[PDB]
């Protein structure tokens, strides 16, 4: 079947702020990707093999608000630009890509899946360029192979004149290396 | 929730319509030159193309548009009026082979529906099933290009 995605907002600005401070989130979780925010920015986090990964440049070394209070990161790798917390109870995990697919699909925070042509183990070109603004907020999102397996997490956009033509990602292998270290 | 595919019907038959680029497209062999109903009265087709077996009305309410394919994949997926997804290998410009042939009944009532690529984007509109002895083994479709062109 084709890769289709839908997004659902679970909380607003004020609820987010209280939760950020209390660190206690009682909301029910669902999904493979979570729309995540801090007091400064909003991005994405992807659950892969029971771990909720995201970009260190987004999460920093912060805890994640859970029903039991704040949860300390399981993995933190400033070099890999990754952080991982135990996947929230309720989330569904993606599995790393087996078949080395050349055609990948980036899922944006808007739940749009855009195809990218892999041009390296960490890069791929948007077959269809989009404004850099369209990609804002999607760091930490998954890059899926046709089978819907996780190939990588969106990290940076190769922008020019405000238009992104390529994307830089953290291949799913850096995850294992990060867990191993 | 908004849908990309409308399950429609005339007095004669029932088929599908797919919203792509703000237009609700469907097969001319189902709609003809018929007007689409709306709470404000009938709305005329914005596009009628007998040759391409294509018609289009402005997208209805409760609908959301589909994005045309841009990855040129040949691994297609047909969505039936029952929300079934059928993998189809693109055999050509406007032809594709079911990865698993199904009884013609299974595809009946799905003309107008979409042929999605691995990214869920619109590759084309299911035009007609190509079957041998009552078993659909392939399908005919209207490539999105035609739609983009007709617009």
């Amino acid at each position: 079947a084709p890769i289709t995605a839908y997004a659902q907002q679970t909380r607003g600005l004020l609820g987010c702020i209280i939760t950020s401070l209390t660190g206690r989130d009682k909301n029910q979780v669902e999904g493979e990707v979570q729309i995540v925010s801090t007091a400064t920015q909003t991005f994405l986090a992807t659950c892969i093999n029971g771990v909720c990964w995201t970009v260190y440049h987004g999460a920093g070394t912060r805890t994640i608000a859970s029903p039991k209070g704040p949860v300390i990161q399981m993995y933190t790798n400033v070099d890999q630009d990754l952080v991982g917390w135990p996947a929230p109870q309720g989330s569904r995990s993606l599995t790393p890509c087996t078949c080395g697919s050349s055609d990948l699909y980036l899922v944006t925070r808007h739940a749009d899946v855009i195809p990218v042509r892999r041009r390296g183990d960490s890069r791929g070109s948007l077959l269809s360029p989009r404004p850099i603004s369209y990609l804002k907020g999607s760091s930490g999102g998954p890059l899926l192979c046709p089978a819907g397996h996780a190939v990588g997490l969106f990290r940076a956009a190769v922008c020019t004149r405000g238009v992104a033509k390529a994307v830089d990602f953290i291949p799913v292998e850096n995850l294992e290396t990060t867990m191993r270290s | 929730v908004e849908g990309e595919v409308q399950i429609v019907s005339t007095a004669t038959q029932t088929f599908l319509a797919t919203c792509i680029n703000g237009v609700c497209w469907t097969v001319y062999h189902g709609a003809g030159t018929r007007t689409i109903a709306s709470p404000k009265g009938p709305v005329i087709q914005m596009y009628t193309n007998v040759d391409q077996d294509l018609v289009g009305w402005p997208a209805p309410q409760g609908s959301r548009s589909l994005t045309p394919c841009t990855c040129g994949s040949s691994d297609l997926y047909l969505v039936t009026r029952h929300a079934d997804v059928i993998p189809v290998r693109r055999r050509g410009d406007s032809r594709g082979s079911l990865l698993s042939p199904r009884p013609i009944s299974y595809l009946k009532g799905s003309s107008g529906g979409p042929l999605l690529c691995p990214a869920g984007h619109a590759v084309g509109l299911f035009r007609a099933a190509v079957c041998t002895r009552g078993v659909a083994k392939a399908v005919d479709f209207i490539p999105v290009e035609n739609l983009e062109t007709t617009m």
Binding site: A1, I3, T4, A5, Y6, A7, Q8, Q9, T10, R11, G12, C16, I17, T19, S20, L21, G23, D25, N27, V29, E30, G31, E32, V33, Q34, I35, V36, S37, T38, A39, T42, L44, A45, T54, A59, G60, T61, R62, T63, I64, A65, P70, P88, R92, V107, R109, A111, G141, P142, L144, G148 | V1, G3, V5, G62, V79, H82, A83, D84, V85
Partner: peptide, 22 residues
Amino acid sequence: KGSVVIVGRIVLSGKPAIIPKK
């Protein structure tokens, strides 16, 4: 610092479905 907060989700596991009338 404050904790990272889940403010929404994106679901990839959903399959085409006929929207139920309500």
